[PDB]
Write an enzyme that holds these catalytic residues in place. Sequence first.
Site, mmCIF file in Angstrom:
data_model
loop_
_atom_site.group_PDB
_atom_site.id
_atom_site.type_symbol
_atom_site.label_atom_id
_atom_site.label_comp_id
_atom_site.label_asym_id
_atom_site.label_seq_id
_atom_site.Cartn_x
_atom_site.Cartn_y
_atom_site.Cartn_z
ATOM 1 C CG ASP D 43 -0.955 0.029 -14.311
ATOM 2 O OD1 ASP D 43 -0.885 1.145 -13.753
ATOM 3 O OD2 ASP D 43 -1.326 0.072 -15.601
ATOM 4 C CB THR D 76 -5.584 3.299 -13.954
ATOM 5 O OG1 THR D 76 -5.076 4.271 -14.883
ATOM 6 C CG2 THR D 76 -7.035 2.976 -14.426
ATOM 7 C CB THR D 77 -5.695 0.244 -9.605
ATOM 8 O OG1 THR D 77 -4.860 -0.274 -10.635
ATOM 9 C CG2 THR D 77 -6.480 -0.917 -8.918
ATOM 10 C CG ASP D 361 3.700 2.706 -14.397
ATOM 11 O OD1 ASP D 361 3.005 2.832 -14.899
ATOM 12 O OD2 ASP D 361 3.816 1.758 -13.392
HETATM 13 N N1 LIG Z 1 6.654 1.323 -2.242
HETATM 14 C C1 LIG Z 1 5.753 1.574 -2.252
HETATM 15 N N2 LIG Z 1 5.074 1.761 -0.893
HETATM 16 C C2 LIG Z 1 3.846 1.952 -0.590
HETATM 17 N N3 LIG Z 1 2.856 2.137 -1.351
HETATM 18 C C3 LIG Z 1 3.007 2.007 -2.874
HETATM 19 C C4 LIG Z 1 4.499 1.789 -3.166
HETATM 20 N N4 LIG Z 1 4.553 1.739 -4.557
HETATM 21 C C5 LIG Z 1 3.358 1.981 -5.007
HETATM 22 N N5 LIG Z 1 2.547 2.351 -3.840
HETATM 23 C C6 LIG Z 1 1.059 2.553 -3.873
HETATM 24 O O1 LIG Z 1 0.386 1.817 -5.039
HETATM 25 C C7 LIG Z 1 -0.718 2.433 -5.453
HETATM 26 C C8 LIG Z 1 -1.441 2.284 -6.727
HETATM 27 O O2 LIG Z 1 -0.379 1.945 -7.446
HETATM 28 P P1 LIG Z 1 -0.580 0.556 -8.450
HETATM 29 O O3 LIG Z 1 -0.932 -0.319 -7.839
HETATM 30 O O4 LIG Z 1 0.691 0.340 -9.271
HETATM 31 O O5 LIG Z 1 -1.952 1.098 -9.758
HETATM 32 P P2 LIG Z 1 -1.957 2.394 -10.172
HETATM 33 O O6 LIG Z 1 -0.820 3.126 -9.995
HETATM 34 O O7 LIG Z 1 -2.761 2.326 -11.473
HETATM 35 O O8 LIG Z 1 -2.938 2.993 -8.944
HETATM 36 C C9 LIG Z 1 -0.398 3.889 -4.852
HETATM 37 O O9 LIG Z 1 -1.421 4.627 -4.536
HETATM 38 C C10 LIG Z 1 0.911 4.055 -4.172
HETATM 39 O O10 LIG Z 1 0.375 4.640 -2.777
HETATM 40 MG MG LIG Z 2 0.702 1.789 -10.825
#
Ligand SMILES: Nc1ncnc2c1ncn2[C@@H]1O[C@H](COP(=O)(O)OP(=O)(O)O)[C@@H](O)[C@H]1O
Ligand SMILES: [Mg+2]
Lengths: 459, 488, 459, 493
Positions: D43, D76-77, D361
């Site tokens: 994150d 954010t990422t 979150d």
């Molecule tokens: N269970 C999941 N399956 C597929 N993609 C996921 C899942 N959970 C989260 N994501 C993906 O992770 C991406 C970024 O989330 P994260 O890596 O936590 O950082 P941020 O939420 O700050 O962008 C989202 O665009 C989402 O599509």
């Molecule tokens: Mg996230």
Amino acid sequence: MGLEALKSHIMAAKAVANTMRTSLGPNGLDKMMVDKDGDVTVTNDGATILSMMDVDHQIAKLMVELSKSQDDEIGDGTTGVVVLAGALLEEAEQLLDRGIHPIRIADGYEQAARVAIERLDKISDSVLVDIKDTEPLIQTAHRQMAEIAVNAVLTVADMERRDVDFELIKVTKLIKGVIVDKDFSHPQMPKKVEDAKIAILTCPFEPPKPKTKHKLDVTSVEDYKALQKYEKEKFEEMIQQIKETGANLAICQWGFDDEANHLLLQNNLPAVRWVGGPEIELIAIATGGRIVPRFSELTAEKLGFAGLVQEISDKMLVIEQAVTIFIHDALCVIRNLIRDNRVVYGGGAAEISCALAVSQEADKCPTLEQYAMRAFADALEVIPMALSENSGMNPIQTMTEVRARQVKEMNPALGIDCLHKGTNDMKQQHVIETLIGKKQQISLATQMVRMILKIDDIR
Amino acid sequence: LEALKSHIMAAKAVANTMRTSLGPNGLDKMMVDKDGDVTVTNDGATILSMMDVDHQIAKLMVELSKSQDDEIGDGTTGVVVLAGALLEEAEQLLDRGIHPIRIADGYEQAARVAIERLDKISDSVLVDIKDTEPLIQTAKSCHRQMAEIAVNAVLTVADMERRDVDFELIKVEGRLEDTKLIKGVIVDKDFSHPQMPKKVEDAKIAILTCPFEPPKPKTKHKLDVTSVEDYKALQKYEKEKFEEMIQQIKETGANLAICQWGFDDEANHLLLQNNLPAVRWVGGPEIELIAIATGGRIVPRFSELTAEKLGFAGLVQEISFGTTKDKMLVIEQAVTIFIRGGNKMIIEEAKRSLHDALCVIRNLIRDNRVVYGGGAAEISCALAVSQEADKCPTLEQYAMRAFADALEVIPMALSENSGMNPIQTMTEVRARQVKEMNPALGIDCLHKGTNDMKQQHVIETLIGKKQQISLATQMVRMILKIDDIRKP
Amino acid sequence: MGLEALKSHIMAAKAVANTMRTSLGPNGLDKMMVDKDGDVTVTNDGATILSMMDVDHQIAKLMVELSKSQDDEIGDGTTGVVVLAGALLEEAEQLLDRGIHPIRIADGYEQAARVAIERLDKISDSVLVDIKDTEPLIQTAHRQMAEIAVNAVLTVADMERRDVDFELIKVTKLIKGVIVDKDFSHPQMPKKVEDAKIAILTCPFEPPKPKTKHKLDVTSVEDYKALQKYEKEKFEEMIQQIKETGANLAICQWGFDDEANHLLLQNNLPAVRWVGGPEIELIAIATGGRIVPRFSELTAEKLGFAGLVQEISDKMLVIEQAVTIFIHDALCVIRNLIRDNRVVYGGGAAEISCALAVSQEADKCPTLEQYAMRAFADALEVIPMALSENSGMNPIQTMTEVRARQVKEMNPALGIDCLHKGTNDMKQQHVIETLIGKKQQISLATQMVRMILKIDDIR
Amino acid sequence: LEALKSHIMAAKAVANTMRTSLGPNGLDKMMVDKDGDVTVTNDGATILSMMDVDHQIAKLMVELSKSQDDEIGDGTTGVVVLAGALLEEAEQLLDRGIHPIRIADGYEQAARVAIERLDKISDSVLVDIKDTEPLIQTAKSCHRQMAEIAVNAVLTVADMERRDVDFELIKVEGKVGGRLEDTKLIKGVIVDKDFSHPQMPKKVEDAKIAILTCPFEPPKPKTKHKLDVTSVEDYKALQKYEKEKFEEMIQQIKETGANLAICQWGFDDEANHLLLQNNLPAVRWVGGPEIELIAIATGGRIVPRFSELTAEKLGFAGLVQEISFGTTKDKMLVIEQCAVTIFIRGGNKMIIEEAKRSLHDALCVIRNLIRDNRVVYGGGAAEISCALAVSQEADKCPTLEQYAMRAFADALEVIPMALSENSGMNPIQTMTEVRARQVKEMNPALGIDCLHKGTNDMKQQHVIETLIGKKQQISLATQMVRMILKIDDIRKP
Ligand SMILES: Nc1ncnc2c1ncn2[C@@H]1O[C@H](COP(=O)(O)OP(=O)(O)O)[C@@H](O)[C@H]1O
Ligand SMILES: [Mg+2]
Ligand SMILES: Nc1ncnc2c1ncn2[C@@H]1O[C@H](COP(=O)(O)OP(=O)(O)O)[C@@H](O)[C@H]1O
Ligand SMILES: Nc1ncnc2c1ncn2[C@@H]1O[C@H](COP(=O)(O)OP(=O)(O)O)[C@@H](O)[C@H]1O
Ligand SMILES: Nc1ncnc2c1ncn2[C@@H]1O[C@H](COP(=O)(O)OP(=O)(O)O)[C@@H](O)[C@H]1O
Ligand SMILES: [Mg+2]
């Protein structure tokens, strides 16, 4: 190195492409290009540029002879081949970084090349043969040049059919055959050698020195004058040898000098001296005539059946067992038209329509070859852009507007004026690249890019 | 101990070099040589013959890979990758504290299991009537006649009853549709001076590597000549010596002669007046070629020969191809292929694909069995070795498993060179092999097909694989031993 | 330096011992060993290794030829000699540091060597002679090798008694004598030279050039052809000279060539050419034949009485005034068995029992030789340890357990499997080192160590 | 112009740093800080919160990443990865001869296209009964009660009728020690510190709290003094004086209701002495935060004095307690006038800080859903369909914005590609096959498993990103790229 050598080859080849990207089109730059103690040579048309330059990277030298041995010996347009190859490699770099394997990109470039080539059949426009039309078609390359070229290639042609020939032509007057300079040496000889059996000999004329501890010792008159007389007799041996098999004139490299040339006059053997490969193999392929490494040991057989040989103030021969012009370009174009009488309009237009085809066919494609074909389209579109910037126009602006007008007006012709005076239609100005020229161009560029893509490590 | 690990790394460097050139998606390797031209080919058989003789272990990597599989089978690039992987795993087994002699013996035992399993996967192919013809279309409509000409090439020259071994009587002298069938071994050049007879039938061939020069005595010389006829009689002297050699050769057999070194001068002319149409001049080849073909031994002298030596070749002719000429002989005491396709690159492609035909056919003649390629035989062999390793105790237990994982690099290398995932597709295929009980399918590999490998008809014969494994294990056995490397 | 040069020699020699400590036993390492522009040679058996390597320290070169000129020319086992010597020096270092004088250590090593050698008489096991037994005794070094070796050394032997011979053997078929390659040169000569008087001449064949300001001057036919004829006559001088003393074939180094070889045919003198030391001294020691430095000046006397000389496609001679095998190891072993028919079991067992003896006799000893003998025992125990580690077994563990089982089971045989498959008894596997092999080994190692110990300063 | 390429290169460097931390399989980044401890998290919000602040363009990306997304949304990422991709493509567009302002115009138009497309892909989620709980499982195997406490937290504190905007007045405290399933249901606000003194009453019930920001010392003139005490009698006179004037404030508080008080700033030497003898267990000491919490929760009308107060002000709390966790102690109170605060005991010290961000979150997601209840399916699916629409609009547009739109389309597809590589799949192969399965199956839901277990359909696994999360992600990304694509010279005096 393992892989980064690939990106290194991309950089090394696209370096060449960027070197000659300015010399494309009519507004190209001349490039000074001297050579050691030689002089200056300023011209467009990279064909003569690739012959010069330097052996930098073995890929930069691989750029040569693939752009030369074919398009300079078959087609005419050389610069487009290297520019296209460079562009294809530039896009193949972005595809590599995206994660695509090289061989998949080469395969995609092959299939895309098939699409473009097969189009050129649809863009093609046929031209009639056997009289006129070809003549007014040559003014692109001032009036008589068309005529003399037409009948010159008309006299030397297969025509029924298979439609191939070269090389019987080289270098204002009309022409009856191939011609040479120099003289038969010593004008007392006959100038009318008609019905001549030519003895092509690349050899010396010396007494056959034996192999043993030698060191001759001679005392004035007695032995010395007998030495001169000796090698004069030994010269008469070769003289009487050339006249036993064949007759009349001969051709010789290396030395004659001395009296020697005198003696052959008294024996009626008007030979000629002296010249290297050219003018030896010229009269060899023309009349007869094979080549004799000797030196008095031959059978004829070999000699050529040239019908007429004369001397005018440079000796020239006619009626050969072959016609050559006297004072390049269209001579190759006509050959291609003899092979296939179709033409496509140039000025990057054929490239634009080909790009529209490859991209239209790329939209419906699975797996990774999709991106490869699209990259190929963006690669073909570098010709109109380079053409645009070499004249000073805004590259992407003029290029884009034309690519739109081609699909809206349904005209695979208009594009890049380029001379800053015209209607942009390209139908007028009569700018034609034939068919074999473009098809060979694309095939060669894709062959290059495929080769470079396969190569890795390589010392 | 570190000497061993040095050998490991140095050899796996070679393997990792040619790991990309494996399979049909090889990367060609430019490789210029000396002051001469270039030679661009994947198929490491030509790559081991070049590159760099650097470390004695890389040297040893060559010439064990050069003249064993390349001169018996055809596959070469696989042997070196197998050895390299075997050493990559052998490093891990050395870290565990296992003595190299134990890893060598374990590798031997595992290799035995693999070889014995190859017989279980084998599929027979009949001989003496076709069946081979449809089998060679895989080695390269430029594929129709190659199978044919190769078939009759090895059929004409073979033991056949039985023992089934023969090589080497086959070579090629560079459209393909004009490639001609062959009646014997054939040469270029000319007999020198076309006044000579072109029909030398029932020829007794005199092979002479000697020069033709009058016998200069051994004493303080300083020869001097007063000209007139002191010079002309010197000429007449060694003309009488040339003539003295001519009929000296004609004493035991006449017909034609074959010579090296000098002739020139009149010389040949005198030989025409005595009717001895010799030929000049060629080195090792065409001296040893016509020696092994017809007769004929070799004569180093120079006034010392009896015949005996001369070869009894039946016919010798001169044929003019276009303008330049070439002379070719038939009916020998023996047949050799010929190709002319023009463009000069239309040959050397056909040659390199044709050598695979002779090699594969000779391997099939020695033993007529095949195993399906594409790395599937390697997968079934790995499952065999590993299945044997689960029921073995002590230290060889680990060596055998290392051998299995080393055999699974060929499917991985085949997968990565085609753009697929190396370990994923490999594991999936190895799964489908035990599930479907099919020691055939695996690695597409051409990115177009059904993956079954039963279709696509990819065959590596049997002695091809048996020699590949036996050689990889022999190499690794050597490198796993040794140490030091003195180098006085 | 004065003394520390001693420790330097210990380090320099034990360096060699540690170099070849891995190549001991059947699991030894091959050692690449090239030579300048030569090729690779990978083998165990340090005998051929000591021939190669390098002259590093004059003590490291002293390690050679003491391990070679004897055990390679008398016994067979070379590596054990150098390993033992190195170990003895290693323990002699601890004895030196303890304050013991070197010469006292050398003397102690001598007395200990006497103890071990005299044992080997007690451990010994006799083998019968005159038929069979020797044959099944050779399989240690696949069936016919025993037979051919047996009868080969049986044909060439003293046997009544003194029991010594070598060298009449070198290099599958049986054999009737010694054989050579090449030809008599010019096959018109007779192939049946039976009852031949061999003229061994290492010399040139040239006219005896006088000593004065020379510079010959010759004019064509007159003098030149008389020169050729001259030295041909002078050649007939030597020809008629060889036939006056002796007859038939001769043997020559250096040049022949020319006609020369022709003339000897007409005079029936089928000689041979040309070869250096070997095959000259071979036929010299075989038949006759001494050596003649000349060049026509000899009396015979010299010539050899070879009974038969023939040619087959390599010429070979039989019935000589001597039998040699045609296609090493056991040939030396058999010789030792001919000298003394006793054997002791190998695999370090004889070393272990010898160590137990030297130590048992060392417990009862006054002054400093006590420590010297004990060090000798610990030195002999390096063979079982090295053998153990070369196969991968725990060195001191397996070694100790065996040294215990030898005194409890009273069996100077069992010890070090070593092949990782067997009952450890060493009675089976039939591993035998004879007697002269081990006795010579110990004597040579002790001789080395004594020498090194005496040396000091020495440049 | 090369200033722009410097910015484009540095920005893509930041993006390439964080494109490995995208998705559930993202990586950690050690990230130590100052003289203190370490923090390893996915994150990028926290990553950007620290990172290595160097180049002004990176500083700009931190500025705008926290400006809107971290403070309102969640993801954010993705913002920095998408911005990086848009820059990587806009670079090749710069080389092609296109003017930057035209690239930003095309990126704007394409951004509006994708934004307007997310509404077509949208789906609805119900409110008010147990429907959001099962849809929180996306934010994170402790989910079952995490989602429960999440919905409870945000629904208990919300406008809700209606207006649908509410946040804060809720915090989280992890006390380190236990297992994540030891998390408890919550009632009122809970703070750290202690009443001070050990003899204090450790459980004060029915407390009327007095929140004060004042010092406890009797003030002095703060003129230039030289206070010199003469006789020992005057020593005792001084002590008696301050002993009395410390008490003048005590029963002054007790007359308006006492129980326990609350203090900022100083709580002096004796003081706590005199407050124990008078049975007023006050507390010391905490700044603005945690003061205003108890202010709004109970009562409380923070008093800037110092002996001046009437209550009135004092709040009505039902229970105040002091609990000792291991060795150190925190005092927590229940039954307030109302304001709820969550509590976490995770153990291992690193098992907490994970639950805090994972819970954050949840609050953010539910808040966004209350504001507007719509969801698009994640895993890059919405990005794939958005790229499809953008390319569709691009094929039918002329001039230069055409190329910029296509570059935007390819730049959106980095999210499925990064999601692909971070999970071990072939980045372009799986992404391409999915882009084909979205047009052939006409299903703007499936793509990138991503957990390597499932049917790839993404309708199942119920991965929801709401709508304002995506709309704000694209708006913020295009805003960043717009700013970076302008801006030259980078003065930096
Ligand atoms: N269970 C999941 N399956 C597929 N993609 C996921 C899942 N959970 C989260 N994501 C993906 O992770 C991406 C970024 O989330 P994260 O890596 O936590 O950082 P941020 O939420 O700050 O962008 C989202 O665009 C989402 O599509
Ligand atoms: Mg996230
Ligand atoms: N009158 C013209 N108008 C527009 N383009 C032209 C014209 N004449 C030639 N060209 C273009 O110039 C290109 C390259 O020609 P040139 O630069 O002379 O070298 P080469 O012919 O070797 O490529 C061709 O592709 C052709 O399209
Ligand atoms: N059509 C094919 N499909 C899959 N694999 C192939 C095919 N043809 C050849 N191969 C594989 O290529 C491998 C190596 O061949 P190559 O790279 O030509 O060099 P070499 O034959 O010397 O090893 C063989 O092991 C074989 O399994
Ligand atoms: N089968 C065997 N089992 C155990 N030891 C053996 C066996 N064969 C040979 N050896 C040992 O190997 C030792 C040395 O032999 P080797 O290493 O070949 O070189 P060298 O004979 O020159 O010393 C001998 O001392 C002998 O004891
Ligand atoms: Mg192959």
